[PDB]
Amino acid sequence: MNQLTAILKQHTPMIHFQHNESGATLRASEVKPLLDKFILTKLGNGDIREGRLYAKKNNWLIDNEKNYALNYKLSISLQKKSRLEYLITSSTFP
RNA sequence: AUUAAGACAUUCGUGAGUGAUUUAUUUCCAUGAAGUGGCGU
């Protein structure tokens, strides 16, 4: 397999700084670095150094020398562009 | 007066004709617009 497709459900409203665009959704520049660390941690059974050695062994690293990055491409897109906008404050008001 | 005297190795003649500094090469790789509440006990 070359492509992985997943459908995400939202439980809490994300605080997004680029809400102006109608296609504003979860940013992959945030997901990918955390997912890379999560997978390397899981590959090494809770240790990121063993997990990097595992990824280094099976040629899964973009660079074998200095980064945790894994060689995959991540894209997050909206299917239906209808969204709910929330005002989140720490003060009650009518 | 003597196998002697006279006689430009010279005339004409394009280093010229054909020819792509071109072919191959991702300005790309890594990166959280995030962190924290405080006081009125």
Question: Cα(A48)–Cα(A82) distance, rounded to whole angstroms?
Answer: 39
Q: Nearest nucleotide (C1') to the CA of residue A29? A: B32
Smallest CA–C1' separation from A73: which nucleotide?
B29
Q: How far apart are CA A30 and CA A52, in angstroms?
A: 20
Experimental method: cryo-EM
Burial zone of A91 (CB within 10 Å; 0-12 exposed, 13-18 middle, 19+ buried): exposed
Nucleotides of B under 7 A from a protein CB: 29-34, 37-38
Q: Given in angstroms, what resolution was this structure solved at?
A: 2.8
> Which residue's entry shows tokens 């690293």?
A61
3-state secondary structure A9-74: CCCCCCCCCCCCCCCCCCCHHHHHHHHHHHHHHHHCCCCHHHHHHHHHHCCCECCCCCCCCECCCC
Contact A26, A14 (CB under 8 A): yes
| Inter-residue long-range contacts of A43-47, CB under 8 Å, 24+ positions, other chains counted | none
Tell me the CA–C1' distance in angstroms for A39 and B6: 114
